[PDB]
């Protein structure tokens, strides 16, 4: 099964472009990233920054998540993003989206495991 981290890259990362190049960006990207495979995902954001810069947000500003959890982080700087929002005519399998370009701070939930001892090697 696809990992949680890979699924985030698939749904949100587009470091290959600096911004949405046209009004059909979302229609194309929601389809090519499989976000319209079985249903039309309603709202989705793509981030036009390097994978290193997006992963770095996990060590930036800790803020509360929408659901009340405490593992969300907000980027210190704004980032180039594209908001994809379904239009009213959107009807699976013919999903349809409005593309909006923005420069905003992103807020993402991060997961990992702390760097801790896992084996005892020797003493000296």
From Swiss-Prot:
Q: Where in the cell is it found?
A: Secreted
Q: Where is the active site?
A: 12 (proton acceptor), 119 (proton donor)
Q: In which tissues is it expressed?
A: Pancreas.
The root-end lineage is: Eukaryota, Metazoa, Chordata, Craniata, Vertebrata
> Its biological function?
Endonuclease that catalyzes the cleavage of RNA on the 3' side of pyrimidine nucleotides. Acts on single-stranded and double-stranded RNA.
Q: Tell me how this protein assembles.
A: Interacts with and forms tight 1:1 complexes with RNH1. Dimerization of two such complexes may occur. Interaction with RNH1 inhibits this protein. Monomer.
Q: Which reaction does it catalyse?
A: an [RNA] containing cytidine + H2O = an [RNA]-3'-cytidine-3'-phosphate + a 5'-hydroxy-ribonucleotide-3'-[RNA]; an [RNA] containing uridine + H2O = an [RNA]-3'-uridine-3'-phosphate + a 5'-hydroxy-ribonucleotide-3'-[RNA]
A GO CC annotation recorded here is:
extracellular region
Q: Which family does it belong to?
A: Belongs to the pancreatic ribonuclease family.
Keyword Glycoprotein assigned: yes
List, in alphabetical order, the Gene Ontology terms for molecular function in this entry. Answer: lyase activity; nucleic acid binding; ribonuclease A activity; RNA nuclease activity
One GO biological-process annotation of the entry reads:
defense response to Gram-positive bacterium
- Tell me the part of the parent protein that is shown: 27 to 150 of 150
Q: Which cysteines are joined by disulfide bonds?
A: 26-84, 40-95, 58-110, 65-72
Q: Please list the residues annotated as glycosylated.
A: 1, 7, 34, 37, 41
UniProt binding sites for substrate: 7, 10, 41-45, 66, 85
Q: What class of enzyme is it?
A: lyase
Name by which UniProt lists this protein:
Ribonuclease pancreatic
The UniProt keyword set, sorted, is: Disulfide bond, Endonuclease, Glycation, Glycoprotein, Hydrolase, Lyase, Nuclease, Secreted, Signal
Q: Does the record bear DNA-binding in its keywords?
A: no
Task: List its EC numbers.
Answer: 4.6.1.18
